[PDB]
Chain A
Amino acid sequence: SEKACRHCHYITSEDRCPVCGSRDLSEEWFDLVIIVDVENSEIAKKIGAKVPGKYAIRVR
C-alpha cells in the first residue's frame, strides 16, 4: 500500500517518510510523478523535488 507524505509529497510503503521524517502519510493521493534526474528535470524544479523517486502532487 502506497502512501504520500503531506509535508514533502514523497511516496513510501512504510510508516514514516524516508525523506523528511514525517508520520503524516495518506493512502489518499492523486497524480503520480516520478523524478529520475533531479538536476536535469524541469518537473522536479517546478515541484521542488530534491530526491529521486515517486511523489504525489495532490495529497488528500
Chain B
Amino acid sequence: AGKIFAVRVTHGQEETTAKLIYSKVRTYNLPIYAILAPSRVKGYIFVEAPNKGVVDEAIRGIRHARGVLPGEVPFKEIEHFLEEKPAVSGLEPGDLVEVIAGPFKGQKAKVVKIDESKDEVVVQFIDAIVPIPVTIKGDYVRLISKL
C-alpha cells in the first residue's frame, strides 16, 4: 500500500498524462504502484506511491503535469471513484423502487427489466393510468421492496 498523491494536470489531459507517466514508470522501473484518472475529476489525477518524491520524480519531463500536492489523500477520499458495481445489481423484475433524483424524483415504480451492461433500469410507475416503460439510470433509483 503506497500513499495517494494528487497530481495537477492540464484540463482535458488527465488520461493522456496518466498514460505518459505510465510509460516512463515502465521504462525506468519507477516504484509507482498505480494511477487513477476519474472521469469526474478534471485537472488532477492520483498516483499511488511509497512517498511523495517518487511522484515528483516520475512527473519530470511530462509536459502536462504541473506538480504534486504535498498532503497525501487519505484512501477513503478516493474509494468513491473505485466502485465497479452497477447501481442496478440486485434489482429483479417485480421489485419495488423509488426514483430519488431527476424529473421522476419521489415517484415509486415497479421494475420491469434491468440492463446491467448500461447500468439502467426499465420501470413502470405505480400511479400511472397508462403503464408506459420508463428507462432510468441505475443511480437514480433505490430499492424499497423485493418481490
Contacts and interface: CB of A to CB of B under 8 A. Distances in A.
Dominant secondary structure of chain A at its interface with chain B = mixed
Contact of B117 (A6, A31, A57): A6
A44 interface: yes
A40 B2 CA distance: 7
Nearest to B79: A46
A42 B79 CA distance: 10
Interface string B77-101: 0110111100000000000000000
A36 B117 contact: no
Interface residues of A, number: 24
B142 to A, nearest CB: 19
B18 interface: yes
Contacts of A59: 84
A35 B35 CA distance: 7
A41 to B, nearest CB: 4
A45 B1 CA distance: 9
Contact of A36 (B19, B32, B81, B82): B32
B33 A40 contact: yes
22 contacts: A26-B117, A31-B36, A31-B38, A31-B39, A31-B40, A32-B39, A33-B36, A33-B37, A34-B34, A35-B33, A37-B34, A40-B1, A40-B31, A41-B2, A42-B75, A43-B33, A44-B33, A57-B38, A57-B81, A57-B84, A58-B84, A60-B118
Contact of A43 (B15, B34, B117, B118): B34
